[PDB]
Amino acid sequence: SASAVYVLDLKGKVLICRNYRGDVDMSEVEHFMPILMEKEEEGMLSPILAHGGVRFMWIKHNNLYLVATSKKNACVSLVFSFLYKVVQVFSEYFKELEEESIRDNFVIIYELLDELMDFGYPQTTDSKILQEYITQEAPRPPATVTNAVSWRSEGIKYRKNEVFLDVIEAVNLLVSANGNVLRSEIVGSIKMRVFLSGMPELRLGLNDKVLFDNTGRGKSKSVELEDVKFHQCVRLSRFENDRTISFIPPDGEFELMSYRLNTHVKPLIWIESVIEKHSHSRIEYMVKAKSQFKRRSTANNVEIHIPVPNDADSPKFKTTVGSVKWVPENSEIVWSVKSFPGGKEYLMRAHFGLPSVEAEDKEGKPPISVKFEIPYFTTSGIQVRYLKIIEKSGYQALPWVRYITQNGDYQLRTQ
Amino acid sequence: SKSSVIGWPAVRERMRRAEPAEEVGFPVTPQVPLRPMTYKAAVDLSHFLKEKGGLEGLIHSQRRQDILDLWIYHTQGYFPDWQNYTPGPGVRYPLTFGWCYKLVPVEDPEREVLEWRFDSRLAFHHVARELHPEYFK
């Protein structure tokens, strides 16, 4: 129940505002900046502000914070969802999120803001569907918005029917300073770029553990996803009945399904790091990285971020394989490796200077983060079984899919 | 299939070597298609196994079945899930329609000795589907 959706800037200037209910005066935006400054300066800064009886709940974008004032007991989750939808629409329409487009795309921005939400209740949020009614360079609205299928425009025709899938893996590992892993969660991500003719009804099929158990084949390699979240095109009833994933893919790249389950396997990379930091004299970085992943897989662009001392200067690196660079902006040792064969072992010996004068305040212990991205590797063992592309006209589809394994929340706690 | 013919003798020898009773990761061949085995493909594989021999009358074992499924997947790209048998006790029919191979007693269904027996009626009659309609959906 947002009262007015407004967009501010880094200097507190409201780039664009769009009142929805009008129950809040437009002059309350002035106190938002001082309130945010006070909250941040006292540790009480939160995305949901409160100017007396009016609450300013908003998130920070790339260049401006989309703060939306509200007065009643509106759904904060609904406001956040509307803000996320607006951000996604802006990203789809504008390739960049900065002040250069707010002052240059106001003609289309105002129309999009007016059409998206009326009286604080949004009605349309599909960028592809909205692109047929609001353009910056107007006919009747398409029947897709009025029809049930609001994510697949009818009448789309293409020379070929090629759909590219992306089985993106996110390896998140939370290794404590004692050497044990606390949080090891792997979240699957099946992103497909559907480009076909008509309105095909995709019928995705995989070797799911639940599906295998229901069919009676619960003995082969099946992915046991704790959480499986289908997209808007995925029918909830079909998945709830017999694990049937039947939905109409949209025109373009979109997120269809996102598996999420815990992982009980050993880490694909084992990092043995040592810190021989002398008292204001010198420091040693005996970092050894062992690849526990399969030897047939190569981790392209391995980036093991090693947090070095903040005041360290005049450093020397004694490594084995991979480029090691210290970035003063980041204040860490970037263990950059181009290609890492599975089972490889990289040993490094850090040596950097330290000032005699001690630091005035503590800086903490940032965790060591690895940025390994090994494609063509499926740690979870989930493999796509079938993809039923059915069209009324009748055509031979050529679906495609790729499996990419990368490091997600793969942070290692320091000692 | 020259590759299938070549792999049949080695697969049979490996199955015979394994008695009837180390690397992590799941590497995938780049560009190799992966899909479930079809009824026609299963029938052709059963006919080839019957003609070449080594599968009919062989003692059924979990290790031998796993090795055969892995070899079939490597040589054809078929997932090792269509080589399933109906629960016992007694004669177990193939789970995938079109398969001409079945397990029959040779003497708890787990301790019962089973051997692979050719059955041409499997490719035409869905014995496994009739026995377990719920499993077939």
Binding site: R217, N300, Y376, Y386, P399, R402 | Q31, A41, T96
Partner: peptide, 18 residues
Amino acid sequence: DRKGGSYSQAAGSDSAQS
């Protein structure tokens, strides 16, 4: 080719499950 794993064709349905 493409970084992150070469694209592979997918099947149509579970042929072994009827």
